[PDB]
Amino acid sequence: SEESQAFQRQLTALIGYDVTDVSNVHDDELEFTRRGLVTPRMAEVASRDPKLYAMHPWVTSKPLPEYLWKKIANNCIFIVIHRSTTSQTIKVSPDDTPGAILQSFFTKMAKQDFVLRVCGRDEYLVGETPIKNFQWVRHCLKNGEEIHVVLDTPPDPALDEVRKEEWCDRKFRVKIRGIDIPVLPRNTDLTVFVEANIQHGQQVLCQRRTSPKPFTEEVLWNVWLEFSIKIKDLPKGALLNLQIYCRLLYYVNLLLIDHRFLLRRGEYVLHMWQISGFNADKLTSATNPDKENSMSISILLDNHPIARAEMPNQLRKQLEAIIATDPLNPLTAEDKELLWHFRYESLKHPKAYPKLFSSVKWGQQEIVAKTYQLLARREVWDQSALDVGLTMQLLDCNFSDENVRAIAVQKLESLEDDDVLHYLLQLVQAVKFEPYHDSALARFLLKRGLRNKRIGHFLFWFLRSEIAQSRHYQQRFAVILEAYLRGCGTAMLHDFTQQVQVIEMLQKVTLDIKSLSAEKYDVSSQVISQLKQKLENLQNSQLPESFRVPYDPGLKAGALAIEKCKVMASKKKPLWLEFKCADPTALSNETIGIIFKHGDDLRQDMLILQILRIMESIWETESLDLCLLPYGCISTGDKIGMIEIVKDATTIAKIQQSTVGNTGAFKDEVLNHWLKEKSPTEEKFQAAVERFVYSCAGYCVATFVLGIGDRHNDNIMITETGNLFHIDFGHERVPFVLTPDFLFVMGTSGKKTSPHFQKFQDICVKAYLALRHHTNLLIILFSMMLMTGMPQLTSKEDIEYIRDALTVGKNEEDAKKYFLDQIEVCRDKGWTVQFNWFLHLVL
Ligand SMILES: Cn1nc(-c2ccc3ccccc3c2)c2c(N)ncnc21
């Protein structure tokens, strides 16, 4: 039918990639995956609750933190209801349901159903949850704000209507025909060979090379390469990894067993990727779509189907020591055999699972069989509490077995939406380690996306971020995105369509302004002449009357406040943009600000930010509030995207450059004077200093742990109310920024104590050693972030940074000492590093 074609064209535009294109395919796995995803999509669409889906309550079952209870001194929360500029303050208990709040409101007033939607937002307080367990309500207690809510008819679930969809015992060998590239690289005669690896879980099962031969535009081997492995022994998910050295310069992969469990057969011309000059990109089954410029390799496959007793005391100790070791500790051959031979004892310990499944000889069919027989008695696994870190380890690059990876996904099923949103970006990224496009993990995300509008919204942008930037995975991620968009509802398709149209227009402007003033330090009259003009043009006949803010979907932006818009003064040339709020019932006349920037990898900013939210949650469990300010941030395209504007905030550099701004000179007292001038009462001034002690502690700890502590002042900011925050993560050493200006806010001076600095040390140590309780989780997030987020990274050195930073293997005293020593390094150093930046620019 024809309105099936139109709808596909809608989807192509939303996706930014055409999932029906079959130009860059060696087989039909992508189509098979489109059709396969119809079933789980339709299931979750059919079975989701219409009312709660439309209203997407944002809710948690975690206990209300100690520090928020303190903020309720009386067991009564205050809630201002509105009708149409009439309002009443209803007293309410924290265990009151929204249903029960409405019985007490209606009785108060009068003496056909409605819902309490938050003022100024598409956000609702509904369902059988205490109000204290709604996230909006926790956001208002933490910030000392009044819960303002308005009364109206529930939104029509009809609006969310989903359109009806219409739909052998021989050694393995490959023949290397040759390699072809139309133009030669670096252009001196070197030698070149082809390495062929059989790989499973980044484990090399077997390896053969061709001879060296003169690297010309066209090189021919015509050699059968015989491997040590039998055909019947190739495991599902095994890759033929073909690489070219002279040293690693080109790579490509071919799944040996296909999505129908069939051995791969025939002629292949595979167009390869080129290394830049270990990482998720190296694992991709996708070929280079640029058929014209790229290096290609020709191969021939012509090889069909296929689908106790008591352990001694000291060996168990040896086993228990191996199990209790961090995820980045190399297993020895002895360690592996021990794990394997006493696999049944190892299965009683859910934490052994990663090491145990990585002690498996995946290139032996009988062993694989025994492993499946092993996982069939999963009772201890199935009954253990969800340990998100342990589970993420099974979804990383070290596991290619479908059955291992699925018991990890099974575990995730018990995460509330709350917890999914925390892990969503890393779970999306973990799709890069799937052997096949259709996976249990792909389907989990699809299912949870379709179940909750909030998760769907972020799932869309996280998927779309990769589809627009990585050639290596765009095909895979586009098929997943299309499956989502096909079940999300007509209201969300429209909302997404508006959003994409807004940033397509705005990125356009962003690049055009860059070219007008090159690097040169100042933003001219003539440059803030055009920005206004381009905005006026866009608004009056192109740019939507209203769009959802991608980084904060509850908020709806309206018309540009053109006066407040400007080009920012940096060497890259970002748009600072302010919008009116579309919602007539907002409390404030205040603007939604958004920065558009081209220049750096905003995906890296996304990654760090997410780990930061996770860190605030670990700290929440142990009743700590460190007041991070993880700003909203979405990568939309190649080195380009949006960033939330934090209000009443300025950079540390800027505060320093105001009374003076000479050449690298800094002043100890301005930060403290600045806070004093921003606080109209001594009350708010001491509340400022206190938030500075906490937020500064949070960022020092967090930031040390992730190896990003050494920043120029340019990329550290503060709000008027004392909240320090780091920015631009995508952009003699020091473990973190605790400069003498920060110390003087803390009442301290050049090697000496004070009460706020005693406190600062106190909070750092509590904060540090609380992350250390979650060491394995952090090690896996860091490790995955490096692999899916950066350029080429060190399958030891770069990744092992975190273990030494988390001071793995030490008692709580050595760890407290160690961090306290780090504080002292920033003290000795003072201004050294900040000054050096300026010294360097002449270098
Ligand atoms: C002066 N300034 N600079 C930024 C800013 C913050 C975060 C960024 C993250 C990546 C790239 C540029 C960025 C730019 C910024 C911001 N996000 N909110 C309010 N004021 C701000």
Report the separation in Å between the CA atom of 503 and the middle of ligand 1, taken as the mean of its atom positions: 18
Alpha helices of 582-621 — where are they, by DSSP H? 602-621
Determine whether 712 is exposed, middle or buried from the number of CB atoms within 10 Å of its CB (0-12, 13-18, 19+).
middle
Q: How many domains does the chain have?
A: 5
Secondary structure of residue 401 in the 3-state scheme: coil
3 state SS for 688-738: HHHHHHHHHHHHHHHHHHCCCCCCCHHHEEEECCCCEEECCCCCCCCCCCC
Are 752 and 637 members of one domain? Answer: no
| 597, 635, 643: residue to mutate for ligand 1 pocket, most atoms within 8 A of CB | 643
Residue entry with tokens 């064209």: 9
Q: Which residues line ligand 1 (CB under 6 A)?
A: 595, 597, 605, 631, 643-646, 649, 651, 727-728, 730
Which of 645, 708, 720 for a ligand 1 pocket mutation test, highest count of atoms within 8 Å of Cβ? Answer: 645
Asked if 255 and 285 count as a contact pair (C-beta separation under 8 A), the reply is yes
Which residue has its alpha carbon closest to ligand 1 atom 10?
728
- Measured at the CA of 567, the angle between CA 563 and CA 573, to 5 degrees, comes to 165
Residue with tokens 């309206």: 558
Could you tell me if residue 548 is inside a domain? yes
Domain CATH code at residue 516: 3.30.1010.10
* CA 692–ligand 1 middle distance (angstroms): 19
Alpha-carbon span 67 to 72, nearest angstrom:
9
Let me know if residue 722 belongs to a domain: yes
Q: Are 90 and 108 in contact (CB under 8 A)?
A: yes
Q: Which of 629, 560, 644 is nearest to 597 (CA)?
A: 644
In this structure, which residue's CA is closest to atom 8 in ligand 1? Answer: 728
Neighbours of 456 (CB within 10 A): 24
Rounded to the nearest whole angstrom, what is the distance from the C-alpha of residue 249 to the centroid of ligand 1?
37
Q: Do residues 737 and 709 make contact, with C-beta atoms less than 8 angstroms apart? A: yes
Residue 232 covered by a domain = yes
* Same structural domain, 554 and 609: yes
**What three-state secondary structure class fits 610?**
helix
Helices then strands (H, E): number in the chain? 31, 25
Strands 716-719 and 724-726: antiparallel
Domain presence at residue 673: yes
Q: Give buried/exposed letters for 117-133 (b at 16+ CB in 10 A, else e).
A: bbbbbbbbbbbebbbbb
Domain annotation covers residue 840: no
Chain breaks after residues in the chain, where C lies over 2.5 Å from next N: 111, 167, 246, 277, 303, 307, 731
Same domain, 806 and 707: yes
Tokens of 5: 């074609």
Residue with CA at minimum distance from ligand 1 atom 11: 728
Whichever domain contains 314, its CATH number is 1.25.40.70
Are 282 and 402 in a shared domain?
A: no
Q: At what angle do helices 3-15 and 453-467 cross, to 10 degrees?
A: 70
Ligand 1 atom 12, closest CA? 728
Query: In CATH, what number is assigned to the domain containing residue 292?
Result: 2.60.40.150
Whether 737 and 806 map to the same domain: the answer is yes
Look at residues 604, 624, 647 and tell me which one is the last residue of a structural domain.
Answer: 647
Ligand 1: which atom is nearest the Cα of residue 654? 1
Q: Give the DSSP letter string of 163-199.
A: PPP----SEEEEEEEEEE-SS-SS-S--EEEEEEEEE
If asked whether residues 325 and 451 sit together in one domain, one would say yes
Contact status, residue 172 vs residue 231, Cβ threshold 8 Å: yes
CA dist list (Å): 827 to 223, 301, 718, 750, 835: 64, 64, 21, 7, 15
Q: Which amino acid is at 186?
A: R
* C-alpha of residue 645 to centroid of ligand 1, in Å: 6
- Binding residue numbers for ATP: 593-602, 628-636, 725-731
Q: Is 785 helix (H, G, I), strand (E, B) or coil?
A: helix
Long-range contacts of 797-806 (CB under 8 A, 24+ apart): 799/328, 800/328, 801/707, 802/705, 802/706, 802/707, 802/778, 803/326, 803/328, 803/779, 805/704, 805/705, 805/706, 805/707, 806/705, 806/771, 806/772, 806/775, 806/778, 806/779
Alpha-carbon dihedral sign for residues 503, 506, 508, 513? negative
In a domain, 842, yes or no: no
Element of type H or E holding 491: helix 490-514
Position 359 in a domain: yes
Are 611 and 713 members of one domain? Answer: no
Q: How many CB atoms lie within 10 A of CB 79?
A: 24
Closest CA to 92 of 126, 134, 42, 130: 130
| Residue pointed to by tokens 């001076």 | 749
Distance 681 CA to ligand 1 centre (A): 28
Structure tokens at 461: 């942008």
Task: Report the candidate in 596, 589, 442, 429 with the shortest Cα–Cα distance to residue 509.
Answer: 596
What number does the ligand 1 atom closest to the CA of 643 have? Answer: 17
Question: First CA to last CA across the chain, in angstroms?
Answer: 66
Type and span of the H or E element at 136 = helix 135-142
Q: Residue 82: CA atoms inside 13 Å, Cβ hemisphere, count?
A: 15
If you measure from the C-alpha of residue 269 to the centroid of ligand 1, how many angstroms do you get, rounded to a whole number?
46
- The SS3 assignment for 650 reads strand
Q: Is 485:460 a contact under the CB 8 Å cutoff?
A: yes
Listed residue (771, 749, 774, 643) closest to 697, CA to CA? 771
Residue nearest atom 14 of ligand 1, based on CA coordinates = 728
At what angle are helices 474-485 and 453-467 packed, to 10 degrees? Answer: 150
From 492, 493, 488, 463, select the one nearest 478 (Cα to Cα).
463
Tracing tokens 């925050």 back to the chain, one arrives at: 725
Give the pairing type, strands 171-180 and 266-271. unpaired
Mark whether 257 and 154 lie in a shared domain. no
Of 489, 517, 551, the residue at which a domain comes to its end is 489
C-beta pairs of 65-73 under 8 Å, 24+ apart in sequence: 65/620, 65/623, 65/625, 66/623, 67/623, 67/625, 68/138, 68/141, 68/142, 71/141, 71/142, 71/144, 72/141
CB 452 within 8 A of CB 417: yes
Q: Are 512 and 576 in contact (CB under 8 A)?
A: no
- Nearest residue (by CA) to ligand 1, atom 17, is 645
User: Cα of 463 to ligand 1 centre, how many Å?
Assistant: 24
Cβ proximity of 195 and 209 under 8 Å: yes
Q: Which atom of ligand 1 is nearest to the CA of 651?
A: 1
Distance CA 299, CA 294 (A): 16
Distance set, CA 141 to CA 66, 67, 85, 144, 153 (Å) = 12, 10, 24, 5, 27
Question: Could you tell me the distance, in angstroms and rounded to a whole number, from the CA of residue 574 to the centre of ligand 1?
Answer: 9
Measured in degrees and rounded to the nearest 5, phi and psi for residue 223 equal: -120, 135
Please give the method by which this entry was determined: X-ray
Query: Is residue 563 domain-shared with residue 544, that is, in the same domain?
Result: yes
127 in Cβ contact with 115 (< 8 Å): no
- What residues contact 732, with CB distance under 8 A and at least 6 apart? 829, 832, 833, 836
Domain that holds residue 479: 304-489
**Neighbour tally for 391: CB within 10 Å:** 22
Distance CA 622, CA 51 (A): 35
This structure's resolution (Å) is 2.4
The 3 state secondary structure assigned to 407-433 is HHHHHHCCCCHHHHHHHHHHHHHHHHH
C-alpha–C-alpha distance, residues 91 and 72, integer Å: 12
- Do residues 295 and 179 lie in contact, with contact meaning Cβ atoms separated by under 8 Å? yes
Other residues' Cβ atoms within 10 Å of the Cβ of residue 483:
25
The C-alpha R_g of the chain, in whole angstroms, comes to 29
Pair 162, 172 in one domain? no
What DSSP assignment string belongs to 663-675? SS---SSHHHHHH
Contact call for residues 470 and 64 (beta carbons, < 8 A): no
- Ligand 1 atom 6, closest CA: 727
373 vs 365: CA distance, rounded Å:
12
Burial of 622 (C-beta count, 10 Å sphere; 0-12/13-18/19+) = middle
Structure tokens belonging to residue 147: 């819960």
Residue nearest to atom 21 of ligand 1 (CA): 645
Q: Which of 489, 514, 546 is the last residue of a domain?
A: 489
CB 609 within 8 A of CB 630: yes
Reported as type and span, the H/E element at residue 555 is strand 552-560
Same domain for 236 and 345, yes or no, is: no
Q: How far apart are CA 824 and CA 750, in angstroms?
A: 11
Specify if 841 maps to a domain: no
What span, in angstroms and rounded, lies between the C-alpha atoms of 394 and 566? Answer: 47
d(CA 228, CA 171): 6
CATH number of the CATH domain containing 125 = 3.10.20.90
On whether both 422 and 535 belong to a single domain, the answer is: no
Number of neighbouring beta carbons within 10 Å of residue 367: 14
Residues in Cβ contact with 624 at an 8 Å cutoff, skipping those fewer than 6 apart: 763, 766, 767, 770
Residues in the chain, overall count: 843
